[PDB]
Design a protein around this motif. Structure first.
Motif, short mmCIF file in Angstrom:
data_model
loop_
_atom_site.label_atom_id
_atom_site.label_comp_id
_atom_site.label_asym_id
_atom_site.label_seq_id
_atom_site.Cartn_x
_atom_site.Cartn_y
_atom_site.Cartn_z
N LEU A 26 10.09 19.07 -23.36
CA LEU A 26 11.37 19.64 -23.75
C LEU A 26 11.14 21.12 -24.03
O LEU A 26 10.12 21.49 -24.61
N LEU A 43 7.76 15.76 -28.14
CA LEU A 43 8.27 14.72 -29.07
C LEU A 43 7.24 14.17 -30.07
O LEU A 43 7.53 13.25 -30.83
N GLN A 44 6.05 14.76 -30.07
CA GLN A 44 5.02 14.51 -31.07
C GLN A 44 4.75 15.80 -31.85
O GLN A 44 4.69 15.79 -33.08
N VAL A 46 5.48 20.30 -31.80
CA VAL A 46 6.34 21.39 -31.39
C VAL A 46 5.46 22.64 -31.35
O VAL A 46 4.66 22.88 -32.27
N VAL A 133 10.57 24.05 -36.97
CA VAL A 133 10.80 22.62 -36.69
C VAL A 133 12.05 22.13 -37.47
O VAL A 133 12.89 21.41 -36.93
N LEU A 137 15.15 21.40 -35.05
CA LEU A 137 15.09 19.95 -34.79
C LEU A 137 15.60 19.07 -35.94
O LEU A 137 16.61 18.42 -35.76
N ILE A 138 14.95 19.09 -37.10
CA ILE A 138 15.35 18.20 -38.21
C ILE A 138 16.79 18.36 -38.71
O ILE A 138 17.52 17.37 -38.71
N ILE A 206 14.21 6.91 -26.97
CA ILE A 206 13.84 8.29 -26.75
C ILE A 206 13.30 8.51 -25.32
O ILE A 206 13.74 9.42 -24.62
N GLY A 207 12.33 7.70 -24.90
CA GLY A 207 11.64 7.88 -23.60
C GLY A 207 10.99 9.25 -23.48
O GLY A 207 10.37 9.74 -24.43
N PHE A 212 18.20 12.58 -24.37
CA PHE A 212 18.63 13.62 -25.34
C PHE A 212 19.21 14.87 -24.63
O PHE A 212 20.35 15.28 -24.91
#
Lengths: 232, 225
Positions: A26, A43-44, A46, A133, A137-138, A206-207, A212
């Motif tokens: 992403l 996705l783990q 950033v 982050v 994101l959050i 999520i994949g 998203f």
């Protein structure tokens, strides 16, 4: 300053999916004549990079012997590269991407063409600050979930009114015996419990992050925009 | 081991809201006789602590010199002060909480009493790893948005089915009792313009705790396998 405006612009960019040699990432980027700001995630973790025009000049000279150009022209080309492929990856690119990791660093490497010559650029990304982050994101993902829950409550309200109108017909003699399979009155508790059992596992998947990027970016940009405007 | 199991249980835990004289925090915690794991956030940063029986024994003895029972009993009291208060903020607490930031660390302080004596605990927290942040927040919050979007699409399908039934019933009653037919794009547009600014405000994180935790838990449960 120019760097503040890159980070500002970056906050309101949507996320794109990026096909790479081995995996995918992403990615969101914001590019001007002053530099760029990039945020990348698998996705783990950033990662983040910010560069000015000096760094563009320096690194374009390191990676490219076969041509030279002003920093802004290089920044323009990078935007042309990243922009169309952001919107969908069904676009005939001819540019290639790979990445590799070294402790808390990720290097995203690009090969394309410029002036009918090969052009190379490397993004040197470091692990994003917790504040970035949180900001990208959050907080927005939390705001989005709340907004989607409000949408849900609003649609439940509309459904009860539809049922009230259906009851109105029934009570005035429209039908006297049930003669066909019609919908059951809407009950939110049974809607929810059946959803979790039957629909949740696949719906929350999520994949590779593509769901998203393809489903939720209008809402994402609307949410990050609202915080920017509130945070002033 | 001890810690892997404590981390696994922490992941299943919902987020809770915690009041403190100065501010508030989002907190989740998982306490057994083997220690605890704690995650804490002010919505800008995320902090983590884990303790085992050695650390509990050392810290509880240091803080409470005239207290004598083993770690399991101390972890038992911590859980009795903590978990009821995390289930409801409106529940009469025997403890006092404060919170201090020392450099990059967060220290949650507890003040209580046990058997006529004072009872003290400190939860010393460091910045949580990117991996805990993603596991406990980014991925589930992403899961939740996708899931809720599927819900919205389902409720839209149902609204349209009811509309077809309504239009069949007019094969006529009072016009002011007639609803507008449902149109999804126009619903979304109206909502984004009129509702989204207030609907997406996270405040102190309290709405997220009060509205979304059942779904939060369903999603974290799902990801583990």
């Amino acid at each position: 300053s120019g760097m503040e405006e890159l980070e500002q612009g970056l906050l309101m960019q949507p996320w794109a999916w990026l096909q790479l040699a081995e995996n995918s990432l992403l990615a969101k980027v914001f590019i001007t004549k002053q530099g760029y700001a990039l945020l990348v995630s698998d996705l783990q973790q950033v990662w983040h990079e910010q560069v000015d025009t000096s760094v563009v000049s320096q690194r374009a000279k390191e990676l490219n012997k076969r041509l030279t150009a002003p920093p802004a022209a290089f920044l323009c080309h990078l935007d042309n590269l990243l922009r169309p492929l952001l919107k969908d990856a069904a676009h005939p690119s001819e540019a290639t991407f790979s990445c590799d990791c070294v402790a808390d660093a990720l290097i995203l490497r690009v090969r394309s063409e410029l002036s009918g010559l090969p052009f190379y650029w490397n993004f040197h990304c470091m692990l994003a600050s917790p504040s970035l982050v949180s900001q990208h994101l959050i907080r927005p993902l939390m705001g989005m979930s709340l907004a989607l829950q409000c949408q849900v409550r609003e649609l439940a309200t509309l459904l009860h009114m539809k049922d009230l109108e259906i009851q109105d017909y029934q009570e005035s003699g429209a039908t006297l015996i049930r003669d066909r399979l019609k919908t059951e009155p809407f009950e939110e508790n049974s809607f929810l419990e059946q959803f979790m059992i039957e629909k949740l596992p696949e719906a929350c998947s999520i994949g590779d992050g593509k769901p998203f990027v393809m489903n939720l970016q209008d809402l994402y940009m609307a949410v990050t925009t609202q915080e920017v405007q509130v945070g002033q």
